[PDB]
Amino acid sequence: AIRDVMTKFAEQTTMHGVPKVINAKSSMGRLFWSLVCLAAGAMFCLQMSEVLQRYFSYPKKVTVEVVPTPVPFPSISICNMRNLDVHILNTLNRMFIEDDRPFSNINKSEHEFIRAYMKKVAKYAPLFWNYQDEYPEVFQEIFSRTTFSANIDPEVIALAAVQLEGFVVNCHYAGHRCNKTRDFYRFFDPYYFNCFTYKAHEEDNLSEGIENGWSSILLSGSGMLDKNDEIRMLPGLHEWRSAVSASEGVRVVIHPPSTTPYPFTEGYDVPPGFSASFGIHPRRNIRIGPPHGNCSDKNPFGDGTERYRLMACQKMCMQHYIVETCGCADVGLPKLPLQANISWCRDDDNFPDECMFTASEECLQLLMQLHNRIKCARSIKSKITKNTTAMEACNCFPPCDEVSYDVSYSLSKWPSAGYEGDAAYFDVFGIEKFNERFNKTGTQGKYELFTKYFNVSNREESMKDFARLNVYIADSNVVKTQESEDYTRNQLVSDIGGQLGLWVGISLITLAEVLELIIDLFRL
Amino acid sequence: AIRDVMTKFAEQTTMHGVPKVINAKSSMGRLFWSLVCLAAGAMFCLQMSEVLQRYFSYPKKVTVEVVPTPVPFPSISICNMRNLDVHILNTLNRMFIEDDRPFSNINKSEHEFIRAYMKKVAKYAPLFWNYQDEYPEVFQEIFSRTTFSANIDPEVIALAAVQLEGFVVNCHYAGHRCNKTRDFYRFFDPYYFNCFTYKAHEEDNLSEGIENGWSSILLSGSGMLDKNDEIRMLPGLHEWRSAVSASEGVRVVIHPPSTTPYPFTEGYDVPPGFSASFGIHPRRNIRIGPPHGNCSDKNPFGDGTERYRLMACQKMCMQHYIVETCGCADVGLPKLPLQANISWCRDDDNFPDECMFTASEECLQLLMQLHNRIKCARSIKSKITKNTTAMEACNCFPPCDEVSYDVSYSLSKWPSAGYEGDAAYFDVFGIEKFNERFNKTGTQGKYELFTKYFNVSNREESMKDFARLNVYIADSNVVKTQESEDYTRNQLVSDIGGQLGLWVGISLITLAEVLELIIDLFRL
Amino acid sequence: AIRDVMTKFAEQTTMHGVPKVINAKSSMGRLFWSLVCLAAGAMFCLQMSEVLQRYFSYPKKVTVEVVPTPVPFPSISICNMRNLDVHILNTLNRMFIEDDRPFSNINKSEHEFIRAYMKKVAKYAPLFWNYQDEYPEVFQEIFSRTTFSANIDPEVIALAAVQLEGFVVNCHYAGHRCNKTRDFYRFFDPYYFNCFTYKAHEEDNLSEGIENGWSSILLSGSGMLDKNDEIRMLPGLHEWRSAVSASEGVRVVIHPPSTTPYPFTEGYDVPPGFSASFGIHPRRNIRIGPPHGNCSDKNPFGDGTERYRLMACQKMCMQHYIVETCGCADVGLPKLPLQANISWCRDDDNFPDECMFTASEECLQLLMQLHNRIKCARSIKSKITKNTTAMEACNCFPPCDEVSYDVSYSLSKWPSAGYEGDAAYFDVFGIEKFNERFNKTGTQGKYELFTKYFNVSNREESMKDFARLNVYIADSNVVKTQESEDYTRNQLVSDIGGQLGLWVGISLITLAEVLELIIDLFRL
Ligand SMILES: *[C@@H]1O[C@H](CO)[C@@H](O[C@@H]2O[C@H](CO)[C@@H](O)[C@H](O)[C@H]2NC(C)=O)[C@H](O)[C@H]1NC(C)=O
Ligand SMILES: *[C@@H]1O[C@H](CO)[C@@H](O[C@@H]2O[C@H](CO)[C@@H](O)[C@H](O)[C@H]2NC(C)=O)[C@H](O)[C@H]1NC(C)=O
Ligand SMILES: *[C@@H]1O[C@H](CO)[C@@H](O[C@@H]2O[C@H](CO)[C@@H](O)[C@H](O)[C@H]2NC(C)=O)[C@H](O)[C@H]1NC(C)=O
Ligand SMILES: *[C@@H]1O[C@H](CO)[C@@H](O[C@@H]2O[C@H](CO)[C@@H](O)[C@H](O)[C@H]2NC(C)=O)[C@H](O)[C@H]1NC(C)=O
Ligand SMILES: *[C@@H]1O[C@H](CO)[C@@H](O[C@@H]2O[C@H](CO)[C@@H](O)[C@H](O)[C@H]2NC(C)=O)[C@H](O)[C@H]1NC(C)=O
Ligand SMILES: *[C@@H]1O[C@H](CO)[C@@H](O[C@@H]2O[C@H](CO)[C@@H](O)[C@H](O)[C@H]2NC(C)=O)[C@H](O)[C@H]1NC(C)=O
Ligand SMILES: *[C@@H]1O[C@H](CO)[C@@H](O)[C@H](O)[C@H]1NC(C)=O
Ligand SMILES: *[C@@H]1O[C@H](CO)[C@@H](O)[C@H](O)[C@H]1NC(C)=O
Ligand SMILES: *[C@@H]1O[C@H](CO)[C@@H](O)[C@H](O)[C@H]1NC(C)=O
Ligand SMILES: *[C@@H]1O[C@H](CO)[C@@H](O)[C@H](O)[C@H]1NC(C)=O
Ligand SMILES: *[C@@H]1O[C@H](CO)[C@@H](O)[C@H](O)[C@H]1NC(C)=O
Ligand SMILES: *[C@@H]1O[C@H](CO)[C@@H](O)[C@H](O)[C@H]1NC(C)=O
Ligand SMILES: *[C@@H]1O[C@H](CO)[C@@H](O)[C@H](O)[C@H]1NC(C)=O
Ligand SMILES: *[C@@H]1O[C@H](CO)[C@@H](O)[C@H](O)[C@H]1NC(C)=O
Ligand SMILES: *[C@@H]1O[C@H](CO)[C@@H](O)[C@H](O)[C@H]1NC(C)=O
């Protein structure tokens, strides 16, 4: 009954092509309609292959527009390019002037940082004097600022580095004084030592204008320091081999409110004696998930107490690779929160005190091992950069909701010549009374030096050591860059419907027809 | 005849599903085909709900591309950070040196601005001397530069502020001299007093290169001013509490040719003694209408004689809210063109002259009312910023066709050391003959001071007071950001057609079928 | 048999509308169904006109996203704003001090460049002394730096201009010393004379951080030059009429590795005595072909040995138009590689030596022709800019795959005051031994001057002539802007299918139906 069931199907079905093939007029008619059906099906499949290829590519649609939705005021991190305090540096210069031998200066100072620095210098110097020419590269790394920072307790350095009271002369967010003890947070940098981060107390709307922004006056000069008739250097502290080296000014980093700043990768420089204007144009980027792109809401290596950034993830991935291979952490990269209690690669590993007296081969072997650790870390950093598979293995992706800022950099000398610039001196020393901050028991030396240097007669030259920062929102409207799926499932279904209705002519109520036909064939 | 009409319909209709339900093979067949039809309709409706939700969302499509279509050369507005003329400031300093009492200096000068300033200072001082400690905040606002600008006639300040002849030493657009009297327009700023806007005489194509741009030399230094052995201040004029304060240099704003500049929100700073290069990269943004977005072709609060900007609309909305509530206009925001004849909030409201002799409680009550007005304006400004509904109520939207500029900021000391820098002095004083401009009857004092200060021997130090601005188009091709409707009505119709042809199988020539069926049912 | 064939067609066809028109119930029925068919067809055609208008518009889809794919480290081109060597300039100043007459100084120097310069000055001066007032404009162009560069052999200028050994004190890419003879390439600029381009030796991944970037120290000051008691000028070399003129510092251009820099259109300025930080944010733009946009993979006027840029194409198009009309090439635009051996427009065309003795009318006519050539070139440059058809005729299009860089500009005084800045002097003169480079047979004069100027006691002032550049990648992730076709042929086919299934109801297996019908009509 195959002929009968196919004939009944052809007479009752809605399939637009089958009846002509079944109820053919002649052999040539059946052949033609067969080739028409074949051609329709072939073009159908060829087009659907392209359609499904487009869909499974998972394209993205990106829109850029200006929206009034506000973003939080950026956090400002300031690092003084002079890492140590003026008094400590002057004291060190005077001691090295008085006696060049570091061994004689171990217990000559009341400051713990000076004593530790002298101990380290005395422990390293005899080997330097004996083996400088034989192994110059080893001592080029041992006598470095980062190396000393990794071998001295951070709590000891923090008391000798730049202090907030001696760095931020004045602060003003909007029309109110900054709560200097509530808004400023101190964090440690291997090269800049003490650094300070400003966080505005708080969603809220963003106000425009310089007067509505963040204005601060900082002491960043080095004219207070003693001037030497001949060049003399503090070992380790003065590093001519660094790319920053003897730079004078402030390193300013503009970043979201709850993110770790990275001065050596991002930020801006402000010379002393100039007023820097930072016109901030906010931006927001919204990203979508795995099938269409890559984004992450949290740092894989983090602890979940900081706003996510891709730079932090990449740096922590590099640190993870360094720790895994070399067995130590690089001081130039953040410590892993989940893998604490890891010694720095530049740590001397309890370098013995007896090396101060004899430059024995054992002490040199310890320094050799330190240099080998540094070289291991450096090689791992370079290898991983080219090793793209390692970067992908860390699963570092851009944030799914990122706030970023564009900076309009500008400069202008802050203390004007003549009586125009007297306002700066009156504010710093007459109203804020900057000198009287240091009239304390343990800060008398700084007080006398600032009293002598900043007297009224030398106003024009002395005031050049100060700098002013103005961080203001120049455009309250935020440029939003939102990513979205370009080709959804509904659009895919619509395209499939159009192609089904164009080429083959069948529908879903008509693909039931063939289902009933196959049931009838089964139960024939 | 219901059965007959439905049977005839099923036998003659093209509806792909109904005939199987009507001409059912059996009860199970009718049930199946009914559930197939129901399922098709349900999926149809579920997909069309999503489709219509997408359509009525009115999505936008944004394209970013580089096009050769030119944009007009940007207008350049320059404000000298020294608001007053050198002669006026020196005279004021000398008078305050000679006699500290302002009452004795009312009629001691021939300049009207000096007389008005002395009158205001003498009217405010007795209350300051008596009530400074009791009400410090009130006098912190009364003795302000903005307050004095709002209580002195602008036509009086304009003659004492910085003049164009004494500010723009030289100008050159392309290879031709700037028409200094045709291209420069003076406008008043509450803090910078006199400011000047350059408008190029003119669509036209944009030329690249520094030599094809706008080059000008300006006198912005303050070394000409007298240097005092002790700090003495001009009340109101010197404001240590401002975020700009004693800054020295030029405030440069780059904006479209026919727009009001806003130096305190946008612009760049140029220190004296440096050559500033402003590499301009033009941009154009095209936006579309209400159903898909928000854009406006004209400022709602404006008069229609200026190119539209969103910043102007927002500032005028803030001014409108201030005037409505406090009954006065803030001097820090533009005056409303449609609501002229409104006194500033900082206006003293005809403060009597008798206060110069007695510090009576009545005079203090008038100052108290002035302070209350200032505080009302400040509170309204802060409240409206958080009050997002007010911002929406002003109907401020970004322009539908906006031209914007990106600035590449750079600096370099303009007068080179040695004979290299002699070209600057030769141009300023040998060819332009800058000193001989001031050899007039009412400008002799300035002429002598410039003759003494800018002599040949002191060339190296004296020339540091000048600055040079170079504004040039760095990329003649414009980055265009055009917004367009992503999902048009035709695309919606195509998607509806695809879905109709996929799920239900009906068409419009087939939805006539049911129309005839219902007519037949009516006329049965 | 027309009625029979149409009836059989209507009874057997799947066309959803024709059977109702053919097998009409009544006259009103036939009329209605005819108008329904007409309406369906009309709406169909109206929608397809819009669809085809959208398709043949060839719209583009642009996506902006952040990707980890690296781009090559940018090439850095540095031009000293002091074009000539210190020794040559000092010698010229001394000779013009000793004797003002240029004719007496023809053979007084051993340097070939000085002799050629004196010959040119002596050939031009007698006409200048006689006809300065009559034709000031002619001599304003003849006595120009560009004019002298076009009339003196480049190989002669290169030996007298700034040398690499006396310009780049130190270089460091990543942690390694730059191969100063392999990575630096010298190229000639008409205004800056000798300029140098740095190309990193090498796809490769991009490393972040200042210490991983390019750090260099350059001598760019002019304090070494003799200071004159009175203003005296070198004719042609000192050009007060230029927009750059007496600027002191370095012109820094950041561009892709294999592209010609254009300092006068792109770049940044760095003053001496400051450390410039160039935070590089890379970008990549991908563009598509003729039907959807315009892009080119190679410069039409180029030789195919340089990475394509639109700026180069536009400049070479301008040069092509200048050469075609004026018969000469402008020195301010690149020479056409395919049309070499073309004299500059500013070339004096073998100006005779006899003019040194007599200011005859013939010599003035030659200078007049030179001025006419310059004016022709200038007029052609201006005319072509407005002549948009010429710009289109050159077929200059943006590159199909372009790499661009965004620069974060910052400054900070490099040599710190006091012992902090001793590192810079120790590096320059103690380790690099900058003075000892010039202790050669033909450079003794420079050696003595640098020995005297850079002594230890004058460390603070003398070191201000140096500058430091730090070019580092601030964001290793690249912002990609890719253009793609928005409306493909497959989408067009899907929309046609949806519209065919919505309005008219026909398919392709049903447009065969009418093909068989017309065959039957033919063979009736
Ligand atoms: C800066 O902020 C701190 C912390 O909020 C303020 O100190 C607190 O003040 C409140 C009263 O306002 C007290 O109850 C707390 O005991 C104080 N200490 C702490 C640790 O919270 C301080 O007053 C603020 N300074 C200014 C000038 O407002
Ligand atoms: C999201 O990130 C993953 C990272 O694994 C991407 O997958 C990699 O894609 C590259 C090519 O771009 C391949 O070479 C790798 O082999 C892929 N990884 C693996 C594990 O196979 C993925 O393509 C990214 N998604 C999007 C949309 O870009
Ligand atoms: C600067 O522009 C002004 C205004 O166009 C010029 O002054 C006019 O010059 C024309 C002739 O060119 C006269 O008919 C007008 O009477 C002048 N005055 C005004 C108010 O239009 C002036 O000549 C231009 N300066 C230069 C140097 O070209
Ligand atoms: C155009 O602006 C209007 C401003 O009224 C927007 O409508 C407001 O939308 C916000 C949410 O974004 C609501 O909270 C407000 O209640 C809306 N206003 C009113 C009066 O109801 C509108 O959404 C904007 N259009 C687009 C496309 O963004
Ligand atoms: C800088 O690069 C040049 C060119 O590669 C080096 O000179 C070549 O060195 C190789 C051996 O490494 C020799 O075979 C070639 O003969 C040298 N000359 C040339 C022209 O290739 C030079 O050694 C490099 N300098 C440094 C410090 O590495
Ligand atoms: C690619 O460039 C060509 C340049 O010829 C463009 O064609 C020109 O378009 C303008 C309008 O924008 C017309 O005025 C010209 O007449 C056109 N040229 C010719 C020879 O007719 C073309 O439009 C560009 N393509 C795209 C997609 O922008
Ligand atoms: C690159 O990375 C993969 C996976 O991290 C690793 O297996 C491979 O050894 C690496 N190659 C090199 C040369 O380090
Ligand atoms: C500093 O402190 C001492 C002791 O408290 C006091 O006598 C002296 O007046 C103070 N000096 C200043 C400037 O405050
Ligand atoms: C201010 O200090 C300087 C330091 O050099 C000194 O020369 C000058 O005499 C001092 N002035 C007064 C008034 O003490
Ligand atoms: C916010 O704005 C709305 C409308 O402008 C107003 O009714 C409301 O009172 C405002 N709220 C505050 C706290 O000012
Ligand atoms: C200034 O003007 C007076 C009177 O017109 C004249 O005698 C004198 O020479 C002028 N000085 C200069 C420098 O032009
Ligand atoms: C130039 O002015 C300065 C001002 O201090 C003065 O010392 C110098 O003697 C003057 N030179 C001449 C030549 O008048
Ligand atoms: C503009 O360009 C076209 C084609 O290059 C040319 O025919 C025409 O003459 C030009 N017009 C002018 C005013 O130069
Ligand atoms: C300069 O060269 C000469 C001759 O070679 C030598 O005597 C002298 O010591 C050199 N000076 C320096 C500073 O190297
Ligand atoms: C250094 O050079 C300066 C140049 O003015 C000179 O005054 C000084 O005496 C020199 N110092 C030494 C130690 O030669």
XYZ file of N, CA and C in Angstrom, chain A residues 9 42 120 123 128 170 203 234 241 246 286 347 357 364 428:
45
model
N -1.034 11.017 0.922
C -0.196 12.059 1.501
C -0.076 13.244 0.550
N 19.436 22.228 -1.670
C 20.868 22.504 -1.653
C 21.146 23.960 -1.304
N 73.455 47.128 56.945
C 73.444 46.497 55.628
C 74.623 46.957 54.778
N 77.718 45.335 55.979
C 77.752 43.916 55.650
C 78.055 43.686 54.175
N 82.194 44.306 48.262
C 82.216 45.267 47.164
C 83.629 45.771 46.902
N 48.144 71.233 52.497
C 46.745 71.631 52.541
C 45.960 70.749 51.582
N 25.427 55.567 45.384
C 26.069 56.399 44.373
C 25.791 57.877 44.626
N 74.909 57.970 48.603
C 74.438 56.988 49.567
C 74.293 55.645 48.863
N 71.210 53.892 37.947
C 70.854 52.935 36.909
C 69.351 52.806 36.702
N 66.993 60.339 39.671
C 67.027 61.585 40.425
C 65.839 62.498 40.146
N 30.994 48.357 29.851
C 30.192 47.216 30.277
C 30.438 46.075 29.301
N 65.699 39.173 49.131
C 66.072 38.974 50.523
C 67.420 38.266 50.602
N 83.658 41.885 58.726
C 85.080 41.911 59.039
C 85.941 41.235 57.983
N 80.579 35.703 49.659
C 80.420 35.892 48.224
C 79.502 34.842 47.616
N 50.351 78.918 53.370
C 51.151 77.799 53.867
C 51.671 78.085 55.272
